[PDB]
Design a protein around this ligand. Sequence first.
Ligand SMILES: O=C(O)Cc1cc(O)ccc1Nc1c(Cl)cccc1Cl
Ligand SMILES: O=C(O)Cc1cc(O)ccc1Nc1c(Cl)cccc1Cl
Ligand SMILES: O=C(O)Cc1cc(O)ccc1Nc1c(Cl)cccc1Cl
Ligand SMILES: O=C(O)Cc1cc(O)ccc1Nc1c(Cl)cccc1Cl
Ligand SMILES: O=C(O)Cc1cc(O)ccc1Nc1c(Cl)cccc1Cl
Ligand SMILES: O=C(O)Cc1cc(O)ccc1Nc1c(Cl)cccc1Cl
Ligand SMILES: O=C(O)Cc1cc(O)ccc1Nc1c(Cl)cccc1Cl
Ligand SMILES: O=C(O)Cc1cc(O)ccc1Nc1c(Cl)cccc1Cl
Ligand SMILES: O=C(O)Cc1cc(O)ccc1Nc1c(Cl)cccc1Cl
Ligand SMILES: O=C(O)Cc1cc(O)ccc1Nc1c(Cl)cccc1Cl
Ligand SMILES: O=C(O)Cc1cc(O)ccc1Nc1c(Cl)cccc1Cl
Ligand SMILES: O=C(O)Cc1cc(O)ccc1Nc1c(Cl)cccc1Cl
Ligand code: NA
Ligand code: NA
Lengths: 131, 132, 128, 126, 127, 127, 126, 128, 125, 130, 132, 130, 131, 125
Amino acid sequence: VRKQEIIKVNQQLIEAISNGDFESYTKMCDPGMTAFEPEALGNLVEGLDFHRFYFENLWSRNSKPVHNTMLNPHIHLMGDESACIAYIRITQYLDAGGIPRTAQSEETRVWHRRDGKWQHVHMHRSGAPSV
Amino acid sequence: HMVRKQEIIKVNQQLIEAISNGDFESYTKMCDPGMTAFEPEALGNLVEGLDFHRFYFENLWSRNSKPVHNTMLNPHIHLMGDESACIAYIRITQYLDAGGIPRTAQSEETRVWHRRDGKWQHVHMHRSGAPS
Amino acid sequence: PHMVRKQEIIKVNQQLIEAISNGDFESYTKMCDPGMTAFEPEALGNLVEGLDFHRFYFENLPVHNTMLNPHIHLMGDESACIAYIRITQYLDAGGIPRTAQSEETRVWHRRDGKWQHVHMHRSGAPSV
Amino acid sequence: HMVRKQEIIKVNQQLIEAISNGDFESYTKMCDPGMTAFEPEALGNLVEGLDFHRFYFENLPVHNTMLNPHIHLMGDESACIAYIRITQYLDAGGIPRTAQSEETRVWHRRDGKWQHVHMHRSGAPS
Amino acid sequence: HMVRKQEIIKVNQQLIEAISNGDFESYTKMCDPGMTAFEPEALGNLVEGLDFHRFYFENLKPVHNTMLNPHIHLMGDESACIAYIRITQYLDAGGIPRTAQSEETRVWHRRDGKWQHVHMHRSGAPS
Amino acid sequence: HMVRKQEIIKVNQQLIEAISNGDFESYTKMCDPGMTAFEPEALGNLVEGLDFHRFYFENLKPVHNTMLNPHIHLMGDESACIAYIRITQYLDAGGIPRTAQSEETRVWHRRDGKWQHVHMHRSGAPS
Amino acid sequence: HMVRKQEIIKVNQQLIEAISNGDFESYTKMCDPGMTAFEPEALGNLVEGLDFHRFYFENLPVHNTMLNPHIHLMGDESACIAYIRITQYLDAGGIPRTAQSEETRVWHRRDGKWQHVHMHRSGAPS
Amino acid sequence: PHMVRKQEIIKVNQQLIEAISNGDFESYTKMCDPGMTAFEPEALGNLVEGLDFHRFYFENLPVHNTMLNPHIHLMGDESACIAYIRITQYLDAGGIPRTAQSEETRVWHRRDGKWQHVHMHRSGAPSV
Amino acid sequence: MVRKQEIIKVNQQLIEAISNGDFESYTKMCDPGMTAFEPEALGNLVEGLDFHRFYFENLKPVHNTMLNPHIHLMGDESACIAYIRITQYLDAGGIPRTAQSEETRVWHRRDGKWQHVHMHRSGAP
Amino acid sequence: PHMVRKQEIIKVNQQLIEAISNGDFESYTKMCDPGMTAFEPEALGNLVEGLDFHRFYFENLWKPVHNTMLNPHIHLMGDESACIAYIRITQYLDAGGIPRTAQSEETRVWHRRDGKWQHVHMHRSGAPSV
Amino acid sequence: HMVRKQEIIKVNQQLIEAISNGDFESYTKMCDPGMTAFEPEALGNLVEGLDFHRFYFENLWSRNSKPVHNTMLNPHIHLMGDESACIAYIRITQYLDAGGIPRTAQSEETRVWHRRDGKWQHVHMHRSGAPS
Amino acid sequence: PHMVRKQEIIKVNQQLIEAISNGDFESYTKMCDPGMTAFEPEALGNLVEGLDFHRFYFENLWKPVHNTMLNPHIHLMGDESACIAYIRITQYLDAGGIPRTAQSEETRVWHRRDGKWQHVHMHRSGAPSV
Amino acid sequence: VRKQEIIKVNQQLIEAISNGDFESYTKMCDPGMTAFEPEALGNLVEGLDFHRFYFENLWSRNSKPVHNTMLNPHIHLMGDESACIAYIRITQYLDAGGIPRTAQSEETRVWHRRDGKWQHVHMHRSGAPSV
Amino acid sequence: MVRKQEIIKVNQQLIEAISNGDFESYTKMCDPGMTAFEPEALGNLVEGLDFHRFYFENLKPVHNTMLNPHIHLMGDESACIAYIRITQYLDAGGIPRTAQSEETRVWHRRDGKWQHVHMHRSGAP
Ligand SMILES: O=C(O)Cc1cc(O)ccc1Nc1c(Cl)cccc1Cl
Ligand SMILES: O=C(O)Cc1cc(O)ccc1Nc1c(Cl)cccc1Cl
Ligand SMILES: O=C(O)Cc1cc(O)ccc1Nc1c(Cl)cccc1Cl
Ligand SMILES: O=C(O)Cc1cc(O)ccc1Nc1c(Cl)cccc1Cl
Ligand SMILES: O=C(O)Cc1cc(O)ccc1Nc1c(Cl)cccc1Cl
Ligand SMILES: O=C(O)Cc1cc(O)ccc1Nc1c(Cl)cccc1Cl
Ligand SMILES: O=C(O)Cc1cc(O)ccc1Nc1c(Cl)cccc1Cl
Ligand SMILES: O=C(O)Cc1cc(O)ccc1Nc1c(Cl)cccc1Cl
Ligand SMILES: O=C(O)Cc1cc(O)ccc1Nc1c(Cl)cccc1Cl
Ligand SMILES: O=C(O)Cc1cc(O)ccc1Nc1c(Cl)cccc1Cl
Ligand SMILES: O=C(O)Cc1cc(O)ccc1Nc1c(Cl)cccc1Cl
Ligand SMILES: O=C(O)Cc1cc(O)ccc1Nc1c(Cl)cccc1Cl
Ligand code: NA
Ligand code: NA
């Protein structure tokens, strides 16, 4: 049940990403969160400004059909206020010719309850870039 | 915070030492038996337990035929309460290739730690970049 | 009644192929277990569970399919699996007729008297 | 649920270990004489019987991992297991390598004993 | 013998006529409904029936087929096998004249006094 | 009918036995001296006689041939055509196990009570 | 020598110019009905008769050069001419181009009139 | 006597092929007109005249040759030309059996009662 | 460690002047005889400020980020700062893109104000 | 005055380059601050701190080579600090005796610490060592 | 010798002018009808007479759609008596390509001349390098 | 003295480069000896003499460009002759607005003839004009 | 007959080349002869030193079987003391594996009788290099 | 045209000193502050003679040929010579090979002797 709560809070963050809602993303993330991701070219980025840039400049891709599947998530619980979730993300989309395609990425996300709310403190993403 | 994170840095440094020595014994002692791992060698999959990494300790990292050198760069540590932590850093690896030339590889490493029974256990790792 | 039951499975599978050919996702849903699994090229080597992954291809997709000689295994009164080669004739963007081959395994389980599709494994090229 | 799922995982592990041992007589005991197979070695064809696979048992430092198996139970005497197989090996040049294949295996419990009746593999030819 | 091989050349030339004209009906009348085929379009599989070939009749002009020196095996009065190289002259996309070579085996069986095409095997280029 | 197709499967399996053993003599005894052949080794040409195939008997081990689901056409009592996919398991240069697929048509004619191989057509990989 | 060599050069020039005109009825008049041909368009086969070549007369800014022809005279009614043919043409992009082929043509004087009975061409498919 | 004369030309040509197979350049010289000509891959698109060019290949050169169905034209009592496909089975450096195809035209002229080889045109691959 | 905050601030000002195309604020902060190694200069050592003008005049939103800077304080008049710079920009289609470069900047204190005397940049232009 | 300092910095730096060309890690460690940082191609875009990373290349790297320091610019900052920038051009002979030339751009920062000149930071771009 | 070679240079320059103008009339007047030519367009063959080059005058060099420029570089002249000469030089050609960009091509040219009936005739050319 | 001459040569040469960047062949011909010679990539390893060859490029060559003359060295030889060597670095924008840089090494020889400075020879290697 | 003399003098030069006899080559060539050839990279070389270098440094290739054929030479006569000859040269040789190969070059050679002896004054060679 | 023979001879001496590896005769003929553009220097302008030492010390028969030189006489103290240089050498297998370069050399007359003040070479190293 506690694992299912981690799945729900993590899926709420994934919803905020799919809807491009940076306010939902910002409140849901510790303002000191760090990130490894292909867009950062092997560097650890801190704060939310780096990710704000990607939220505000992907409007060319709205209305383009995409669907994201989270595959068999694995959750480590570490007390009552700490959790880590790992899963394969699969993205179905359409290329230029309209042909459906698929991309895979692996995601680790670390969650921490601060002040009674689950906070997103670290993400690690490998595989196909989100852009 | 100023010294608790030093505890996470030292523990993670002992783990990196074990990997560099090919010391699977110390590795197993520092890792939780149900730990998970994303890494290039796993071809995009999530591997559970320590049997997958045992292969690399046995057949490769137990061959000190060439001196190698790892390097942890600028560790960033998150602290989730008193029992849990997460450390993220860049790892640089110097080695000798097939022809004896010094070369360098980069990895990005996330490692998650849980203090269970008064001992830090490695519960999850995510590595990107160079396969070792 | 082994041959009767194999004919039964051939027909149940053909009805599933019909719902796919007609792009009929509702019928496809009625015939598949809600927790079915699938290996297929579109899944990039991963096992996908459920039906949400497959809807994308009913929605965003001059063709003829040839089902070669199927092989059926019966595993008790309420279980079978069928394997066959599928040859697809289609025309690409340039109007050129082309052929693609796939190999398919489908696993069927009769739950409460109704045959349910619970696992598929397709190898070859992505579906056209 | 878990009880029958674990018995299917066991018998599939036994098949996999018989394969890694190159132990064809064990494999033959675990396989129905009329089993079928889709596999890369078969070049898109469905091969029947066990003779085709004897070539690979007779002509062979590895570790095989069976990731998160999914088991469908269909009555008392039928199961389908699906899993990603990771193979850790060492090439000629000694460089360690990994390969991935996806395996569907169908098992029929006959008179008490589980028998391997159909397999579908995609990915690495091994 | 020397007279019957001409009848096989004729029935086979009528079949190639029906192909070149895109006349699936005449083609079907010359083919047994259970005829099998190896051909590049079937990707190494043996295809049975006429549904598979109907796709290329329904979706296919300056075309000329040249049957080169057929070899006929006579196996009694009710069976023949003919083997020949076929050169196809066509205009490609940009109108350039091109040629493609295929090798064809065609087996014929006389059922109720009429020759029926029971099996083909074609190597080379797809149509 | 249902009994005769087994005889064709048998004589054809004996021919493949002679091939796999490298036994040109048994192979020759099953082949009409005027048998023709389309095969990748002949580069699109029809070859007549057995001299051409003798080269591959005289210059060619862990080999296994798998005949997949043959289709037999019976055209009377003295003629048959069999078509099958053959998978060949071999060890290449570096000892690695490899497989190759070919598609084969073989026509048989019963002359004086004995089946003779009169025509073959093979597609796919060279031997 | 030179007298019969010039008559063979003339009749071969007439064939070449009938080809460049796309004039199949002239070409047909100059060719024996049972002539044979090796040519790149035939993909290594020997084609017989004139039907095969009709496709290229019916589906066609060029200049053809016949370099230093070698003529073998074999009695009164037989000659073999061999020559390099250079074709000057303009591609689609308008860029001028040249192509080379080597041609053997065999002529038989029948009842007074020279007839083209065999040709062998290698090089450029044209 | 057209068929008799074609058999005559087939035999004369076969004797020339024999001198080539045996690497017998002296016999080859006896059968070729001193001013014979040749188009062949080894000549790089040029017409070579005489026999000095061909000696190099008799001197610096597990094989079987298959002569497919020849076509003979008769051009009077002392002249013919023969055309045929030649298939060569050989083994490369790695011991692998291989096949090559050539197309050959040969022109024969009976001078003073003896058949002389006066022109050849070979297309395909260089001689192995 | 207290002068390190001062060096971070001065260099952050230079970064902002660069991200704004503010060539006059840039020149105010630079020694007139400053040197530069940079990809845009190929393998040349560039002296002065004329060469840098072209990039202020010719190059919508662009974010230049300093990652974990390292500062060397040398006495009281001299500092060296080294860091990875991450540049987020839009390509031709308006797609977010990221470039990395490694930057070394050397600073000299004159009459209470820091002046930029030498830079070395490698990686992306 | 300042011309004396520029010749002092060029001498200290050519001493460093000589210890580089020798594989003499002993004098290199002497002339370098233990907390020096480094940008270099071998570091793959990362800033490396300390001398362990460089010791690996010194120990595991052993034809006639020639390094010419081209157009050095020295920036003097007070009397306890200098920065030298130059193009290192390396002539050598590869496998086969064919002359080859490589180039790298080098920035070296020096801090006169405890009276001795110390190497606190380097930035190297262009050709790697090997 | 000092002025006779100037005669060979001028005559050869008139020939190059004719080629640049697409003036086949002047070209034919300056060339011997039995002249021979090695050149890249001839694919390694020797062409005899002027019909081969007529094709390039008609279809290409008669299209002044783009200005071009030839250049004779450092002519070297041999004199074989009073009636024969041979001139060898490098030829540079500037032109506009498919996209309108100025480009350059190099040829090496040998041209042989025979004074027949009080007029210099071009009897043989050999060109290497760029095809025009 | 000789410093006045070096600034004179730099000015005359930057005038030439300005006429180059303008496509102003008029002033170019003015500032150049009619018998000047040229090595340049467009000449394919040949020495070209005169100005016709260069006029083709001036007439048939027309985004914001920027040329910076780097580290000029002037050699003065008496008072009627000088030689200037420098690296011309060209910043420009290609198709798509992406900044690009090209480099060429240039040697220019000047002869004060009839009191006016004349361009008698150039050697250009590296990046061509187009 | 005069054309046949040009063929003989030109074949004597070709013999001197095939035998590596630079003395026969040197006396047979005007010391001011010029040459276009692939070895000169598009330049006209003058004198005989350039060609001496190739004579003296090809000993690695002696005993390697080669044969040279001159194809249908075309000769222009220009008076009693001038001539020009053009022909295709075909070279049969063996590669590393012993496999026979062929190379083609086109040759123009200009001859001039000085002091009663045919002198070689200019050569132009295109196609496969002699080295 | 009479000083042109003098320039040809002096430059021919420099060529011979180069072909002999005679670095002292070379230095005798060169201004100590001579400049050089050359492929071996990549895109750098090289000053002095230290850089040229490596090629005299490290580089059997080699023939350096001057092709149709062009000489510019400037007054009475200054000359420029430009020419294609053809270099015949042996490769690793002893096979004759040819390289081309284009060379510009600038000469200054001091006290009756010519000194080499600047060279530009393009093409082959
Ligand atoms: O993946 C995240 O945690 C948030 C994130 C951060 C970032 O720097 C760049 C991209 C993302 N997300 C995203 C993804 Cl996966 C796919 C498409 C668009 C976007 Cl906007
Ligand atoms: O084969 C199925 O069960 C359903 C399925 C799922 C899926 O993820 C991708 C494709 C399919 N079928 C399909 C096929 Cl074979 C061919 C064409 C279109 C479609 Cl829509
Ligand atoms: O997977 C099996 O059921 C048995 C099987 C059959 C077959 O035809 C080809 C290969 C296998 N197994 C195998 C594998 Cl995965 C890897 C290495 C060796 C072997 Cl022997
Ligand atoms: O060859 C036949 O018997 C009939 C046949 C069947 C088939 O599946 C594909 C093609 C064909 N014929 C054809 C050929 Cl050779 C060439 C062009 C069009 C056509 Cl329609
Ligand atoms: O296939 C046959 O009928 C006989 C035949 C003839 C021929 O020309 C070339 C090969 C074969 N058989 C063969 C095969 Cl399939 C595989 C391996 C070796 C051999 Cl020897
Ligand atoms: O060469 C001939 O005899 C006639 C011939 C026959 C043939 O099958 C193919 C082509 C040709 N001639 C041709 C040539 Cl070379 C070039 C262009 C058009 C034509 Cl139409
Ligand atoms: O075919 C001939 O007439 C003679 C001839 C000449 C020639 O230049 C090159 C090859 C050949 N014959 C040959 C052939 Cl087909 C095959 C193998 C060896 C030889 Cl030696
Ligand atoms: O980096 C500097 O100090 C100033 C400088 C000089 C120069 O020649 C080229 C670029 C820059 N700056 C810049 C950078 Cl880092 C990134 C984007 C735009 C600009 Cl405009
Ligand atoms: O260049 C330095 O300051 C020290 C240094 C560190 C390092 O990690 C790698 C190389 C070096 N030097 C070096 C150079 Cl430039 C060239 C050849 C060998 C060496 Cl050993
Ligand atoms: O560089 C010169 O002195 C004159 C010259 C001559 C020439 O043949 C080709 C180009 C140039 N100059 C040029 C340059 Cl560097 C760059 C762009 C345009 C031009 Cl037009
Ligand atoms: O061909 C000549 O005229 C003389 C000549 C000159 C030269 O610079 C280089 C080579 C050659 N001859 C040659 C030829 Cl073709 C082939 C093999 C060896 C030699 Cl040595
Ligand atoms: O060319 C010079 O002036 C001196 C010079 C300097 C230099 O840095 C490199 C090479 C050279 N000369 C040379 C040349 Cl051109 C050719 C072969 C060997 C040598 Cl050693
Ligand atoms: Na098709
Ligand atoms: Na073969």
